[PDB]
Design an enzyme around this catalytic site. Structure first.
Site, PDB file in Angstrom:
ATOM      1  N   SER A 239      19.032 -37.576  31.344  1.00  0.00           N
ATOM      2  CA  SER A 239      19.227 -37.423  29.915  1.00  0.00           C
ATOM      3  C   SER A 239      18.159 -37.642  29.108  1.00  0.00           C
ATOM      4  O   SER A 239      16.995 -37.324  29.363  1.00  0.00           O
ATOM      5  CB  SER A 239      20.548 -37.948  29.491  1.00  0.00           C
ATOM      6  N   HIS A 381      27.887 -34.496  33.716  1.00  0.00           N
ATOM      7  CA  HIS A 381      26.621 -35.122  33.169  1.00  0.00           C
ATOM      8  C   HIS A 381      26.266 -36.430  33.878  1.00  0.00           C
ATOM      9  O   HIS A 381      27.072 -37.394  33.328  1.00  0.00           O
ATOM     10  CB  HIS A 381      26.493 -34.971  31.964  1.00  0.00           C
TER      11      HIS A 381
END
Ligand code: NA
Length: 401
Positions: A239, A381
């Site tokens: 990320s 994610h």
């Protein structure tokens, strides 16, 4: 203030028309057609634009930072590994911030050892459930623990890594600069201001650039460690730390292999798609992340001097793994795939092939026989054991024989 999550577009058909800036055309209009012209003329132009206009310049040092190997255990993990703590002094103040680096090398492996250099959201004790990192809470005067030992084990897979005969080194990004919009109050930045300067110039580093600079400082130690192989150090993050690791790979050619863990918007995803997260959502919600200059492109993706395929192109000829997650539409997984596809013409200048498929592949279908690998895997994610499996099988292609 503004929402952004609910204003975003997740509908492929409502994606705007756009034209990718041409990665092979220089500012004066001459097209590149040799690796020589890429290295001599075009690559420095693209490195300049990304440094000036989105990540920000970082200090160049006369000499290496001081560090000390402040702890060692050659019988760590029941003799499986050697564990080293290395404290790196980031400024000229010894009471200022330090990177506290934690290195694991497999025992019973002879040569210089390839290493994965990673950067983490949380302190070092979360990487692995290491039982001799243990002092009771009732007597502990150190920083109070907010998570627990080995909480992030599923994101790091130390057991998988040692098993390939590789090492793992990580530090927490808050060592270099806290992830807060605070004008760098408790980070490294003010230690490098001039006397007539009270915040970075518009073309000087923000947080991502500083966190990337941190990986480069860790490489300054790693390359002096006789057991690690300075030719085969990979970088990885997830990320926002994936955006960082790609930049560290781009601006530090020493790193042998780059791992983009859902780097998404302003990572490897093409900005002109305006899909999911957008430049302005980014800068408004995290103004410390990028340099001052980058905010001029809020809601103005048409005017970027570049797009993220040219960031990927900075990696060539070195390999890069691009990893998408199926539920992570905020990162624009197709956009992340196209960031890699847009870089193919540069890799071709070195006689290397491409990803291996023309359109975005179906889930759980990795492609990794070329210099740019890609998968979009089921689930959320994150960085999962599935991702490390592909990462390590890709690394073996380059580090083993
Ligand atoms: Na996006």
């Amino acid at each position: 203030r503004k929402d952004y999550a609910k204003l975003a577009n997740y509908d492929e058909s409502k994606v705007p028309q756009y034209t990718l800036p041409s990665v092979l055309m220089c500012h004066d209009g001459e097209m590149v057609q040799t690796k020589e012209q890429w290295e001599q003329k075009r690559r420095p132009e693209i490195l300049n634009l990304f440094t000036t206009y989105m990540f920000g310049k970082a200090p160049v040092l006369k000499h290496k930072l001081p560090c000390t190997v402040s702890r060692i255990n050659e019988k760590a993990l029941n003799g499986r590994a050697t564990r080293k703590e290395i404290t790196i002094q980031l400024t000229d103040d010894p009471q200022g911030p330090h990177i506290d680096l934690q290195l694991y090398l497999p025992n019973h492996v002879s040569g210089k050892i390839p290493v994965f250099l990673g950067i983490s959201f949380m302190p070092n004790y979360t990487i692995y459930d290491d039982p001799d990192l243990s002092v009771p809470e009732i007597t502990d005067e150190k920083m109070k623990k907010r998570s627990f030992r080995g909480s992030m084990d599923k994101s790091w897979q130390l057991d998988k890594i040692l098993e390939h005969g590789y090492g793992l080194a990580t530090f927490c990004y808050n060592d270099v600069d806290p992830d807060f919009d605070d004008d760098f109050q408790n980070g490294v930045h003010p230690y490098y201001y001039e006397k007539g300067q009270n915040f970075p110039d518009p073309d000087q580093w923000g947080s991502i650039a500083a966190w990337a600079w941190g990986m480069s400082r860790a490489m300054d130690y790693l390359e002096t460690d006789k057991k690690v192989d300075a030719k085969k150090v990979a970088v990885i993050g997830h990320s926002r730390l994936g955006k960082t690791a790609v930049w560290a790979g781009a601006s530090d050619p020493r790193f042998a292999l780059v791992i983009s863990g859902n780097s998404g918007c302003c990572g490897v995803a093409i900005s002109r798609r305006c899909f999911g997260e957008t430049v302005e959502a980014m800068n408004v919600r995290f103004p410390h992340w990028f340099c001052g200059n980058y905010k001029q492109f809020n809601d103005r993706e048409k005017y970027l001097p570049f797009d993220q395929h040219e960031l990927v192109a900075l990696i060539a000829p070195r390999p890069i793994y691009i990893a998408s997650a199926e539920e992570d539409n905020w990162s624009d997984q197709k956009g992340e795939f196209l960031g890699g596809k847009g870089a193919e013409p540069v890799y071709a200048l070195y006689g290397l092939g491409g990803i291996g498929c023309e359109e975005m592949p179906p889930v759980d279908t990795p492609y990794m026989n070329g210099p740019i690998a890609y998968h979009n895997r089921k689930g959320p994610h994150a960085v999962l054991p599935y991702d490390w499996e592909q990462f390590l099988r890709f690394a073996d292609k380059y580090f083993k024989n």
